[PDB]
Design a protein around this ligand. Structure first.
Ligand SMILES: CC[C@@H](C)n1ncn(-c2ccc(N3CCN(c4ccc(OC[C@H]5CO[C@](Cn6cncn6)(c6ccc(Cl)cc6Cl)O5)cc4)CC3)cc2)c1=O
Ligand code: HEM
Length: 528
């Protein structure tokens, strides 16, 4: 008889339900804990799964170390397991593929195999609004990218350069961080100045003078609120009934409302020209199946483009200033190139003259090598994927993670990779360039291979379309900083370590530098 054992099964179950509440809470904790450990052990036997990083707390996984020190985590895993490994992250399984083959695996993955919008829509849809970027099918995103790129032409950059320059000068004139007409030296926190200079310059050029004027008002606080809603927390908790989440949603409505008002106002007056991204999207935002973007979708798209451009660029110019603050030799070299190309400062800066400043562009290029603003990009796996030349299968429901910024910092691809050296890019100062064959996913021909160890703008269908804008903006900005100021660290201070916990990787604050006018007597005109 085994029937009597099946009775004690039922009996055991009943005694289980009658345990003292202290013992039940205890078990409510210890049972998932034990089961988690046993599951990992069994998992480690499968030869069709990449090794999985061991973790103690269920669901949470390796969340804490990935959040604080993602590259140190990757290096340690790479040492133990090689280039492919998985780890658990707040309920998700992330399969990391390091190095250029990882780039190809993920960036050039078939559209059916992986989804960016499934990975990202929570990080962005609550902030930007509905119907755009990741809150739409991939083919809509492809065309949105085509639309936005339409305002990012050489001719647009030629007209943006003096607008960006004017904002930089105005910021030197009026901001309390500078006041160059009143002060000849001062101390700044670059994580205060660079986000402000970035939003002022990006607004003026992409959004136009009206939207720029708005930032001189209490309206600016809405950008602050919307900005605070752009946080890694959204990855897990995109909506919680806290005040944080409420100021964000309000801001999105208020800011999209303001863009819609401008859009409808311009159409009303037949005042649609070729000034900015707004004019461009009004004139050119009809999908190929004949559907037009709504005014709300246009406004939402504007928010997304400005927000993304805001954080990558601000972080980058902050890093440029910080690396140059201990490199007066590089400031000196950059200054000589400015003197040569602009004829001792007699020539006004133009987009065409920016292209003749290779060391300036190499400085941007080198900063983006050492400080990729996005340490990890990922996709949700939609169909089981076989890893070439292995036995691994990444099942649907997993996420794949790629990290070009990690490869940027490997000695094998960049000798002395932790040394800042703009000259590693001599005669190679282009922001990026296709090393051969090209393809077009709907927003223009881009490189077909994504095997370059240097990939600051990613690749494949989700590739950045902002790189020439970012270089234009960063170039104007740094050209003027260099011609106007010298700067250095307070005694004993040096380049800060990256903070990886925000949406882009920023310098750990407070990152202060001391500036000095190259020409103490130089005045900036205009009224204030
Ligand atoms: C346990 C709780 C707590 C301790 N914890 N523990 C771990 N974590 C955690 C770890 C990591 C992360 N991640 C989430 C993902 N993230 C990130 C990934 C991709 C990314 O952007 C890629 C896409 C989407 O956004 C943009 C960014 N961009 C690109 N160019 C310019 N910006 C983007 C593309 C297009 C447009 Cl229009 C806008 C935007 Cl924003 O590209 C941004 C951040 C890094 C941090 C979040 C939380 C926690 O919160
Ligand atoms: C230094 C500056 C920047 C860097 C390093 C950068 C980096 C990137 C990267 C790595 C991606 C690919 C993301 C992925 O594959 O998951 C991307 C995508 C994108 N970026 Fe940028 N970016 C920068 C600036 C900008 C700017 C200024 C804009 C807008 C003006 C912009 C708009 C976009 C857009 C529209 C995409 C496409 C998103 C998609 O197709 O899924 N970026 N960027």
């Amino acid at each position: 008889i085994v029937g009597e054992a099946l009775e004690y099964v039922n009996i055991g179950l009943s005694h289980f339900l009658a345990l003292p509440l202290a013992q039940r809470i205890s078990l409510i904790i210890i049972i998932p804990f034990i089961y988690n450990i046993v599951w990992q052990l069994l998992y480690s036997l499968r030869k069709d799964r990449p090794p999985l990083v061991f973790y103690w707390i269920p669901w949470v996984g390796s969340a804490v170390v990935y959040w604080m020190k993602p590259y140190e985590f990757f290096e340690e895993c790479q040492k133990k397991y090689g280039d492919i490994f998985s780890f658990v992250l707040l309920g998700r399984v992330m399969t990391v593929y390091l190095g250029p083959k990882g780039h190809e695996f993920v960036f050039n993955a078939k559209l059916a195999d992986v989804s960016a919008e499934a990975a990202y829509a929570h990080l962005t849809t609550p902030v930007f609004g509905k119907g755009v970027i990741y809150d739409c099918p991939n083919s809509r995103l492809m065309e949105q990218k085509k639309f936005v790129k339409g305002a990012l032409t050489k001719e647009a950059f030629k007209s943006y350069v003096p607008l960006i320059a004017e904002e930089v000068y105005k910021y030197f004139r009026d901001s309390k961080n500078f006041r160059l007409n009143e002060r000849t030296t001062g101390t700044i926190d670059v994580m205060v100045t660079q986000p402000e200079m970035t939003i002022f310059t990006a607004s003026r050029s992409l959004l136009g003078k009206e939207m720029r004027a708005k930032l001189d008002t209490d309206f600016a606080y809405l950008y602050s609120d919307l900005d605070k809603g752009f946080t890694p927390i959204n990855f897990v908790f995109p909506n919680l009934p806290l005040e944080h989440y409420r100021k964000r949603d309000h801001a999105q409505k208020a800011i999209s409302g303001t863009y819609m008002s401008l859009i409808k106002e311009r159409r009303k007056n037949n005042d649609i020209q070729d000034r900015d991204l707004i004019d461009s999207l009004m004139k050119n935002s009809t999908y190929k199946d004949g559907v037009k973007m709504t005014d709300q979708e246009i406004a939402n798209l504007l928010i997304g483009v400005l927000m993304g451009g805001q954080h990558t660029s601000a972080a980058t110019s902050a890093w440029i200033l910080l690396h140059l603050a201990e490199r007066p030799d590089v400031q000196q070299e950059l200054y000589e190139e400015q003197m040569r190309v602009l004829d001792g400062g007699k020539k006004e800066l133009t987009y065409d003259l920016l292209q003749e400043m290779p060391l300036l562009n190499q400085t941007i290029k080198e900063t983006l090598r050492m400080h990729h603003p996005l340490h990890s990009l990922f996709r949700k796996v939609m169909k089981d994927m076989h890893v070439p030349n292995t036995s691994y299968v990444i099942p649907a429901g997993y996420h794949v993670l790629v990290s070009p910024g990690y490869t940027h910092l490997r000695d094998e691809y960049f000798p002395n990779a932790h040394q800042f050296n703009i000259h590693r890019w001599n005669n190679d100062s282009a922001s990026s360039y296709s090393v051969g064959e090209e393809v077009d996913y709907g927003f223009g021909a881009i490189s077909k291979g994504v095997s370059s160890p240097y990939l600051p703008f990613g690749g494949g269908r989700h590739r950045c379309i902002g790189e020439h804008f970012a270089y234009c903006q960063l170039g104007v900005l740094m050209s003027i900083f260099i011609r106007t100021l010298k700067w250095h660290y307070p005694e004993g201070k040096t380049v800060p370590p990256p903070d990886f916990t925000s949406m882009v990787t920023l310098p750990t604050g407070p990152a202060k530098i001391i500036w000095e006018k190259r020409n103490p007597e130089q005045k900036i005109g205009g009224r204030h």
